[PDB]
């Protein structure tokens, strides 16, 4: 679990949205795995507007913060999952991790502030779902 708060957004794993992530819907992306709802409060994190391909994501199932290098926001395959049927998910970004279900809502973050969020694993590999292109956050 785990979810940003920016402005008055809190993103969170579409997968992971509660009742009231949707009572509140700003927008969702199945494709992307991502669900923003309205606060009421005001939230401090800086979202990363750069290009950086390396950062610490936040590992719950090792309660560990790991550096890694990410792939650029892409269009990649993920195949089963109790959460969604063999679909390619847009604005994906693969590393070199450990991701297990739990994972998902751990973000990753550069200097510039927060990347992304957890939203894939296995085989060695962890995606982060991008937020860097939704400059409407602030
Ligand atoms: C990173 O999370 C996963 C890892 C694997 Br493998 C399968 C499903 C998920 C989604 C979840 O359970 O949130
Ligand atoms: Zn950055």
Redesign the pocket.
Same mark, same amino acid.
């Given at each position: 679990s785990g979810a940003i708060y920016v402005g008055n957004y809190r993103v969170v794993?579409r997968?992971?949205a509660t009742h009231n992530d949707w009572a509140n819907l700003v927008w969702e992306d199945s494709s992307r795995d991502l669900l923003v709802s309205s606060t009421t409060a005001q939230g401090c994190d800086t979202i990363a507007r750069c290009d950086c391909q390396t950062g610490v994501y936040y590992c719950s199932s090792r309660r560990k913060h790991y550096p890694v290098s990410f792939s650029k926001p892409s269009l990649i395959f993920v195949e089963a999952? %109790?959460?969604y049927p063999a679909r390619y998910q847009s604005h994906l970004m693969l590393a070199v991790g450990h991701? %297990?279900? *739990?994972?998902?809502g751990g973000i990753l973050r550069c200097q510039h502030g927060v990347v992304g969020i !957890?939203?894939? *694993? *296995?085989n060695g590999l !962890? *995606?982060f779902a991008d937020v860097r292109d939704l400059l409407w956050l602030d």
């Open positions: 794993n997968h992971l999952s %109790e959460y991701s %297990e279900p *739990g994972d998902c !957890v939203s894939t *694993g *296995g !962890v *995606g």
